Structures are given as structure tokens and as C-alpha cells.
Design a protein around this nucleic acid. Sequence first.
RNA 1: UGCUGUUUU
Length: 185
Amino acid sequence: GDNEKMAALEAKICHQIEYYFGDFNLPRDKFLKEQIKLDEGWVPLEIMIKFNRLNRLTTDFNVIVEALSKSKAELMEISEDKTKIRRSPSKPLPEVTDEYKNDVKNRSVYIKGFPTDATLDDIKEWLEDKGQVLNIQMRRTLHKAFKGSIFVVFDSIESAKKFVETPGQKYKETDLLILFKDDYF
RNA sequence: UGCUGUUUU
């Protein structure tokens, strides 16, 4: 059903854009920050479609606008003429205080045992039924080769604990080592 | 402290 397929695509679009403008990417994204200074947070759709994971989903402005209009996250706003988008001023970036960093750390997790040829797509699929994940960091060498270990940030301490305490976890044939970031060094 | 990079650009 084409409506059915269009709805699945639009959900993916929302999630991707919401990641780029999110707490775990925006503060470290020089290119996106450049664009956000120029008019009250607004960024043109002609620039957004240059972002590679978004480009692969769609380059149609009409489809992007429809997607964001139906989002349940309430993060993104659309301009009057429908050519530009922004993070809402109701949702500011967190102040990076001791209390914030402690809270994030307590729900961050280290996982080791993925093959070196695994993709971000592969890791996301594996994580699908494991709880709400807000960030995936693939760990790399100096020369950018994947080490086979990751850091992940969960939505809550409750979700992180449920994941860490589950006993027999594997990726395909191989046993994983799973630790709170606090326990890794 | 700080500064610098950082492609899910």
C-alpha cells in the first residue's frame, strides 16, 4: 500500500532530522551551527538535503514538510512559506552542568563484540528491541577503522539497567561484553 | 582550567 510505505518513510525522515538538531549532535556540528546563526534558527531545505543520510531517504521538499507536520516529538517547526525549518525556542539545548553530565553518564553503556565490517545500519537494527536509544558512537582507531566496540546513550537509567542486567546477549554467533561506562576504562 | 579538531556533515 503506497500510503503505508509513505508513512514508514516519513517516520524515518523525522527521526533523522531530529537527530541532527538534537542534544547529542548539534553542539558538536560546526557546519550545522554555521547555518543556524543566520536567521533566528531557520535553515533552508536546500541546505538540509545535502546531509547524506537525509539525501538517501528523499530530496522532495513536500515530503519533508509533510513528515515533520505529523511528528510526535514536537521538536521541529516549519516556516510560513514552508522553505525553512528550525528547532523550537521552547526546546533549548541543556546547560552543560555537573548535574547534567552525571545524569547522562549514569545511562551510558559500553558494548564490545561487533565485527569490524558492521555498519551503523547493522547496529541500529540489532538495537531495535532493546529500549529507547538517543546516541550511538562507533569507536575507531587513528586511521578511522572500526574497533568493534561502541558507546550508547539510553533514554533513562531504568532502560539502561534493564539492558545491562540481561544475561545471554549475542550479535549473531558471538558473545558480547557489556559494561556501564562508569565500569569501562 | 583553557585551546583545537571531530560526516548519523
